[PDB]
Amino acid sequence: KTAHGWAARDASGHLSPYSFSARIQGDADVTIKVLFCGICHTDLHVIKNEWGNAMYPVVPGHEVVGVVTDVGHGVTKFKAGDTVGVGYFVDSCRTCESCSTGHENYCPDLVLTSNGVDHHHHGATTKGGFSDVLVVSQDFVVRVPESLPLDGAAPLLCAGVTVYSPMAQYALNEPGKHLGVVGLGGLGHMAVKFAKAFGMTVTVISSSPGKRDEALGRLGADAFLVSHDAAQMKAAAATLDGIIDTVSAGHQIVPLLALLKPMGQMVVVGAPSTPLELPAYAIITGGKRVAGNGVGSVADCQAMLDFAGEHGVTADIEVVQMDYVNTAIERLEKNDVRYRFVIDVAGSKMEET
Amino acid sequence: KTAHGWAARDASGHLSPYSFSARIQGDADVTIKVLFCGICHTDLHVIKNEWGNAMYPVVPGHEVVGVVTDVGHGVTKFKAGDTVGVGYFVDSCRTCESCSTGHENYCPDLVLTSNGVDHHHHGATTKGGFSDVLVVSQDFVVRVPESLPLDGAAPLLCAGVTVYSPMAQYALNEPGKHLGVVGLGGLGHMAVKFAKAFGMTVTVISSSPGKRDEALGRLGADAFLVSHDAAQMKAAAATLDGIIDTVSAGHQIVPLLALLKPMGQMVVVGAPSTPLELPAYAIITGGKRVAGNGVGSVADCQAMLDFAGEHGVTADIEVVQMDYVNTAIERLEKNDVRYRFVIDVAGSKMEET
Ligand SMILES: NC(=O)c1ccc[n+]([C@@H]2O[C@H](COP(=O)([O-])OP(=O)(O)OC[C@H]3O[C@@H](n4cnc5c(N)ncnc54)[C@H](OP(=O)(O)O)[C@@H]3O)[C@@H](O)[C@H]2O)c1
Numbered sequence: 073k074t075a076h077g078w079a080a081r082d083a084s085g086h087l088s089p090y091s092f093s094a095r096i097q098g099d100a101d102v103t104i105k106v107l108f109c110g111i112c113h114t115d116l117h118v119i120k121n122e123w124g125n126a127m128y129p130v131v132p133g134h135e136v137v138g139v140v141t142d143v144g145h146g147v148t149k150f151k152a153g154d155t156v157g158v159g160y161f162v163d164s165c166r167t168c169e170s171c172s173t174g175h176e177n178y179c180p181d182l183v184l185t186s187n188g189v190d191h192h193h194h195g196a197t198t199k200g201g202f203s204d205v206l207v208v209s210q211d212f213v214v215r216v217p218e219s220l221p222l223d224g225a226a227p228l229l230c231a232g233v234t235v236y237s238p239m240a241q242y243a244l245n246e247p248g249k250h251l252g253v254v255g256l257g258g259l260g261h262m263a264v265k266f267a268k269a270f271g272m273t274v275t276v277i278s279s280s281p282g283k284r285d286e287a288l289g290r291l292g293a294d295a296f297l298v299s300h301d302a303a304q305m306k307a308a309a310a311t312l313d314g315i316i317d318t319v320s321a322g323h324q325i326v327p328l329l330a331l332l333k334p335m336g337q338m339v340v341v342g343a344p345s346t347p348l349e350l351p352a353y354a355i356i357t358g359g360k361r362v363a364g365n366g367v368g369s370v371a372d373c374q375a376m377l378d379f380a381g382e383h384g385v386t387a388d389i390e391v392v393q394m395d396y397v398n399t400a401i402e403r404l405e406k407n408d409v410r411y412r413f414v415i416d417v418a419g420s421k422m423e424e425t
Numbered sequence: 426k427t428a429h430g431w432a433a434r435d436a437s438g439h440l441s442p443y444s445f446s447a448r449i450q451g452d453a454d455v456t457i458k459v460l461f462c463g464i465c466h467t468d469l470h471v472i473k474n475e476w477g478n479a480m481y482p483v484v485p486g487h488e489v490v491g492v493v494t495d496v497g498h499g500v501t502k503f504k505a506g507d508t509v510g511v512g513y514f515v516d517s518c519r520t521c522e523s524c525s526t527g528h529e530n531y532c533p534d535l536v537l538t539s540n541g542v543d544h545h546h547h548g549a550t551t552k553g554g555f556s557d558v559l560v561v562s563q564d565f566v567v568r569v570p571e572s573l574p575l576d577g578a579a580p581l582l583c584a585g586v587t588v589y590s591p592m593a594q595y596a597l598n599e600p601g602k603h604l605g606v607v608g609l610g611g612l613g614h615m616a617v618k619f620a621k622a623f624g625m626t627v628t629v630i631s632s633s634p635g636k637r638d639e640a641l642g643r644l645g646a647d648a649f650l651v652s653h654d655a656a657q658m659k660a661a662a663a664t665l666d667g668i669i670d671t672v673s674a675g676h677q678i679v680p681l682l683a684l685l686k687p688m689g690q691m692v693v694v695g696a697p698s699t700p701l702e703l704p705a706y707a708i709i710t711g712g713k714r715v716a717g718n719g720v721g722s723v724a725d726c727q728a729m730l731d732f733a734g735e736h737g738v739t740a741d742i743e744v745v746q747m748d749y750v751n752t753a754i755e756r757l758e759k760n761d762v763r764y765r766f767v768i769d770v771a772g773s774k775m776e777e778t
């Protein structure tokens with residue numbers, strides 16, 4: 073009934089061992105030994121309270137690959153030994169229009185995996201995958217295809233589904249279509265990977281000239297634009313069918329909309345604290361479209377994993393021990409990872425002795 | 426892995442939560458969820474460093490009852506779900522004369538359950554039953570009969586085997602035999618219970634007249650003798666087939682030997698710091714015998730449990746939570762318990778949250 077993770081106690085975001093009372097496995101619950109957990113920039117936003125919604129102490133982590141060690145009496149979707157994943161949320165109300173039409177990810181009572189409010193269990197705060205053992209409803213766990221490496225698959229549970237889902241939603245998943253990806257980070261590099269697997273033409277828009285070689289080589293993007301180079305950006309005006317914006321800091325979207333063809337679709341998935349400034353003319357003139365996307369439904373996540381397993385899509389990762397997590401967080405803040413940190417949780421000393 | 430117990434850090438003996446590295450279940454090892462652990466004066470002597478051999482931090486506990494939760498691939502003597510006990514020691518060299526003949530309790534390289542030196546694992550210190558999970562060689566685990574309460578059985582693993590083994594060895598084990606028990610603490614009350622289960626007539630011998638009602642009421646002894654009453658002692662001269670001497674305070678042995686019939690047997694299980702004064706004539710004249718013993722072999726312990734299960738022999742206990750342990754120890758220093766504390770380990774919060 074005691075679980076063990078690493079938590080932040082205040083806005084410094086400094087992580088250190090934390091023991092806490094864990095939820096007991098109920099009839100519909102699955103017990104998961106955490107093997108790997110990706111570090112998402114959302115975890116950094118939360119532990120530093122950049123959105124103002126941190127409930128300290130915070131146990132981060134919501135890109136989880138693990139193995140089932142026990143299931144409740146009512147569980148039928150999983151059994152001990154199954155390789156499974158947990159993403160950004162672990163529960164929902166189950167009844168509202170969103171929950172009833174397969175869009176539980178937009179439920180107003182969503183229970184986040186990390187720093188969420190467990191409405192079905194006395195409103196306790198949820199502790200994420202920076203911990204040894206999770207207890208999750210069978211209806212919010214996904215199966216990891218055996219063809220995927222467990223560490224390279226972990227960032228798919230948030231980074232991957234968040235970019236995969238809008239590509240399917242907005243028909244930005246067909247050969248010949250031209251997609252822009254803004255911010256070649258965790259989400260961004262997954263967008264490039266999935267877009268190229270769909271056969272799309274991909275332009276990367278980046279503030280980091282040093283990412284050019286890997287973007288055009290390893291990742292296979294077709295073009296690379298430096299966003300603070302007015303000449304490069306102007307040359308690409310009105311060339312894109314769609315653009316996925318993953319930028320985590322405040323930024324201007326007018327130059328990004330300028331890259332879209334008339335009627336083109338911008339998908340915002342980055343979540344900076346500073347509001348985006350949208351002049352009306354920048355969407356009126358060419359009938360352009362802006363949409364937000366939040367991860368995917370559980371079924372969306374499973375479909376993304378099935379696709380990744382069939383096409384060999386995995387994140388480019390740097391695997392680290394938990395004792396390195398504060399250095400990893402600092403490097404993520406400094407934009408110094410290619411392109412996702414993954415914590416080897418099961419191989420780390422989680423408790424201090 | 427990491428295990429969780431309560432440990433002393435210095436000679437104050439004050440116990441508080443303590444996490445430590447646990448050794449891995451090997452091929453011949455058994456994993457035991459600790460349910461109950463008795464407390465006895467040996468634990469107090471260790472944690473207060475009164476023998477100068479405390480290796481801090483010290484996790485006490487050597488009267489352990491638990492349930493098997495996992496076994497190594499080569500284990501044949503136990504399976505998950507078995508109710509088991511662990512006594513004073515958990516390993517031995519296995520090769521010496523004592524070990525090879527089933528008397529490993531006399532191994533010079535004995536591995537104690539608490540504050541022992543695990544010679545087979547880099548001499549690491551052993552942590553006792555004041556903890557949540559133990560890993561022990563299958564050859565040093567005993568089976569607790571289901572006919573016994575798990576908490577009342579725990580002190581049998583120390584005091585019970587200490588008094589049972591000599592009763593069986595020296596034929597002080599049949600109706601019509603008259604047994605004296607010197608002292609009325611943990612060991613004394615155990616000796617009376619086993620003696621009664623054998624059908625013997627039991628005389629409690631004490632230097633404190635105040636223990637009379639205790640001996641004749643609660644415990645149901647047949648007679649009570651004040652060791653200072655010269656006339657009453659003289660009237661009982663040469664009436665006892667055996668005596669179990671449990672007293673740890675300095676005391677004269679000659680008056681107790683006088684109670685023995687010729688060829689009678691005295692068994693010393695308490696250890697006074699002052700040597701016993703034994704005039705040769707006191708044993709020569711009537712061919713009397715004096716022997717000592719502590720806890721027995723694994724086989725001794727199992728034979729004691731089998732007998733106890735067949736006759737309903739259980740210790741008189743007071744069950745306490747771990748967070749009360751320091752108060753229990755203070756009370757035990759004054760012998761303010763009837764007659765043994767047992768910690769409800771599985772029912773206690775062992776970690777800090
Ligand atoms: N919508 C959802 O459901 C969802 C899911 C997951 C994450 N997110 C959010 O998406 C964002 C990205 O997450 P992530 O894990 O991918 O983060 P990340 O790895 O840090 O990548 C973000 C990227 O944004 C770009 N960037 C950063 N600072 C910038 C600046 N000052 N100006 C311009 N560009 C900048 C960088 O790319 P370049 O170096 O190429 O410029 C950087 O690599 C975060 O806000 C996070 O909370 C949202």
Ligand SMILES: [Zn+2]
Pocket residue numbers: 112113114115134160230231
């Ligand atoms: Zn995320």
Ligand SMILES: [Zn+2]
Pocket residue numbers: 164165166167168169170171176179180181
């Ligand atoms: Zn809902």
Ligand SMILES: [Zn+2]
Pocket residue numbers: 464465466467468487488583584
């Ligand atoms: Zn003992």
Ligand SMILES: [Zn+2]
Pocket residue numbers: 517518519520521522523524529532533534
């Ligand atoms: Zn030996």
